[PDB]
Amino acid sequence: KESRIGKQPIAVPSNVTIALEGQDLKVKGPLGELALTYPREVELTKEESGFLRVKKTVETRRANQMHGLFRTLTDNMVVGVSKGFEKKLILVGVGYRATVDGKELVLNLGFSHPVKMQIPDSLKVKVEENTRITVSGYDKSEIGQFAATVRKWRPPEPYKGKGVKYSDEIVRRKEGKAGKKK
């Protein structure tokens, strides 16, 4: 089944400049600047050719756990500070709508009181329609984690699928009626 390890060469266009000093590589771009801390026992340098390089100490099975890890934490920041990321959220059910009020967003999902969600840093939220809830971000952890909190309230029930669901999310509509004999 699954194949062998494989690196994903993602660097330059110089739309993103890297600057490593000590177990802390800096990522820049036309959007913003991100920073992540990396453990020791590993080295990283900026090749003159134009590719994020990374090496390991030995060829142990434990080394692959690290090398094969940092390999992504160096590319997700690239496309994150260039192509950017935007997640679309769609709601279902009567009475469910999305409306912005400045830096905060309010929703109404059955709750007697309109729940409010604050927008952190390095993240932007927009609402084109009362059914669409897009949230642009830089990295992936923030924009992603912020997508779980906005769906943590009331997820789509396996009966009608209402509340908050990601873009093009197949909740798989299941028949609520039971007892019937085929």
Partner RNA sequence: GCUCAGUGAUAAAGGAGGUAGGGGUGCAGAGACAGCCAGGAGGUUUGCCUAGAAGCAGCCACCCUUGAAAGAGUGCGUAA
Q: Does 103 bind RNA (CB under 7 A)?
A: no
Contacts of 161 (CB under 8 A, 6+ apart): 92, 171, 173
Task: Give the nearer residue to RNA in terms of CB position, either 121 or 175.
Answer: 175
Applying CB under 7 A, which part among 55-63, 67-75, 94-102, 119-127 lies near RNA?
55-63
How far apart, in whole angstroms, are the C-alpha atoms of residue 149 and residue 147?
Answer: 6
- Other CB atoms closer than 10 Å to residue 138's CB: what's the count? 23
Count of alpha carbons within 13 angstroms of residue 123, beta-carbon side:
20
For residues 133 and 98, the answer to whether their CB atoms sit within 8 Å is yes
Write the residues followed by a gap in the chain (C–N more than 2.5 A).
Answer: none
Which of 8, 30, 48, 61 binds RNA (CB under 7 A)? It is 61
Q: Does 1 bind RNA (CB under 7 A)?
A: yes
Rounded least distance, CB 6 to RNA, Å: 9
Q: Does 3 bind RNA (CB under 7 A)?
A: yes
Tokens linked to 122: 């390095």
Q: Does 182 bind RNA (CB under 7 A)?
A: yes
Task: Give the nearer residue to RNA in terms of CB position, either 148 or 178.
Answer: 178
Q: Does 60 bind RNA (CB under 7 A)?
A: yes
**Which residues sit at the interface with RNA, rule CB under 7 A?**
1-3, 60-62, 175, 180-182
